[PDB]
Amino acid sequence: TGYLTQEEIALLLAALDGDNKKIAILCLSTGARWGEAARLKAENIIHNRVTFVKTNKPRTVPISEAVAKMIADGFLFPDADYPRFRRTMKAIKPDLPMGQATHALRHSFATHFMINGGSIITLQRILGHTRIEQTMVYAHFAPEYLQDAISLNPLRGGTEAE
Amino acid sequence: TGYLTQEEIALLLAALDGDNKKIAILCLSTGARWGEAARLKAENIIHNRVTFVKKPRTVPISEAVAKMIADGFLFPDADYPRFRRTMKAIKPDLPMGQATHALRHSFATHFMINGGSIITLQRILGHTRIEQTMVYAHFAPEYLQDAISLNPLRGGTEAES
Ligand SMILES: [Zn+2]
């Protein structure tokens, strides 16, 4: 449940190349596990929407034109090399627990998603978690706004309505 | 269907008066149950923050609301049965004895529809466990394109410096 800082991300991407790099970008964009991202086919990307299939239930996550352009243009990543990815990751983040390299980028997506004001519920869906309790590992990263009781109530913080 | 629409709210408030109206406004603002709102005292409102006592929890309100409800017990001329009658007239299909909670559900429901956090809602409602609050989860928009803009690459292909 560790994650990469902004600066760790920067180093990671600088140090990777080829399909590993593209996969990293995809995982950082979508919260994909390494495996499901690496096995991805052209047909799983329709109108800038990536579909990770049934194995864990299916789920779909949108990506920018730029990302879609870069990763697509059969299997998208035939020259993926997980061990080299792992090596490079461990070099940037030495304190990373064993075999957690498959999930580090997923946890980085999630973590920054919450830090940046994302909804825990939307995140649950994006990650394809069956239960919200799974997604609550990222909850403490969220800012909390009790004054939303005022502005989001159905009177909009007033006395009237509408 | 468990809660009041915007238009049902409008009718309800138009049709109530006196302390009932104020209580309704308070429940719609805070997710208060009828009872805990009706039994509220001046001392439970400090700096535009309402405290519902013994599990206790505190919920902020706008100046306007505080001004209106706090000029002892705030609502000595409350009349629940009249409230109930009026509610039933606006929303006939409302389940039995649910009139005490209809406004709490409407607060919660709109809070989520309007983009509120399920976690914050948990705290506001004073739910012990998030699972209790997940009854309102399906009302949340799921703005999947936030996967793009809230990315650690900000939807791009690369890092910043
Ligand atoms: Zn209830």
From Swiss-Prot, chain A:
<comment type="function">
    <text>Integrase is necessary for integration of the phage into the host genome by site-specific recombination.</text>
</comment>
<comment type="similarity">
    <text>Belongs to the 'phage' integrase family.</text>
</comment>
<feature type="domain" description="Tyr recombinase">
    <location>
        <begin position="1"/>
        <end position="151"/>
    </location>
</feature>
<feature type="active site">
    <location>
        <position position="106"/>
    </location>
</feature>
<feature type="active site" description="O-(3'-phospho-DNA)-tyrosine intermediate">
    <location>
        <position position="138"/>
    </location>
</feature>
<feature type="active site">
    <location>
        <position position="33"/>
    </location>
</feature>
<feature type="active site">
    <location>
        <position position="129"/>
    </location>
</feature>
<feature type="active site">
    <location>
        <position position="103"/>
    </location>
</feature>
<protein>
    <recommendedName>
        <fullName>Integrase</fullName>
    </recommendedName>
</protein>
